Amino acid sequence: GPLGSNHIPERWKDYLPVGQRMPGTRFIAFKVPLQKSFEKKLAPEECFSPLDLFNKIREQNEELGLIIDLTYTQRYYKPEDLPETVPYLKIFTVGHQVPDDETIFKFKHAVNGFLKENKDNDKLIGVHSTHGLNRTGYLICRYLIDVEGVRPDDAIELFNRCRGHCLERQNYIEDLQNGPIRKN
Numbered sequence: 001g002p003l004g005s006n007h008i009p010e011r012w013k014d015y016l017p018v019g020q021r022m023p024g025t026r027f028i029a030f031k032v033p034l035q036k037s038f039e040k041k042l043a044p045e046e047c048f049s050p051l052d053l054f055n056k057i058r059e060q061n062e063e064l065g066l067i068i069d070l071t072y073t074q075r076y077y078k079p080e081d082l083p084e085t086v087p088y089l090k091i092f093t094v095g096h097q098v099p100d101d102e103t104i105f106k107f108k109h110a111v112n113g114f115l116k117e118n119k120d121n122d123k124l125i126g127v128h129s130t131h132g133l134n135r136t137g138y139l140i141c142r143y144l145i146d147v148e149g150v151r152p153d154d155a156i157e158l159f160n161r162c163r164g165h166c167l168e169r170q171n172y173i174e175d176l177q178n179g180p181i182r183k184n
């Protein structure tokens with residue numbers, strides 16, 4: 001039958017796989033984990049599977065309570081294949097424009113619903129895009145700004161320090177700093 005796609009996304013090898021939990025929040029960021037079909041294109045040290053993700057999370061003494069997947073370009077992993085049964089939500093975040101208001105609303109709604117169902121624990125919301133940096137950083141910071149009243153640059157700096165890489169997209173940064181609070 002037909003060939004599946006298995007290309008390593010551009011620059012994916014270049015980022016630390018998993019960030020630190022952001023203190024004062026229940027967010028953690030990471031780049032997309034890659035299922036086994038991708039690994040023949042990777043050296044052993046470059047591999048980062050869904051198992052590796054759960055192992056790194058456990059290593060940091062945390063636990064994921066929800067994964068939010070922002071990716072759309074290819075199939076990277078099957079939620080059915082997550083070696084742990086953790087709730088999963090896709091929110092396609094497409095293109096380089098500032099994530100649209102419909103997308104921002106879906107992200108807040110997912111986070112708020114998670115927190116409401118999980119007041120009694122410290123499980124985290126794991127968010128990933130391809131690099132777990134730009135679309136991920138935007139949405140996490142936009143949440144902290146609109147919902148928790150965090151100063152935009154404080155959100156960015158906390159996101160960056162915990163991720164291990166700085167949010168790159170200049171239009172994302174400018175909207176976080178100077179754009180409107182979106183309706184909740």
Ligand SMILES: [Cl-]
Pocket residue numbers: 070071072073074129130
């Ligand atoms: Cl993507």
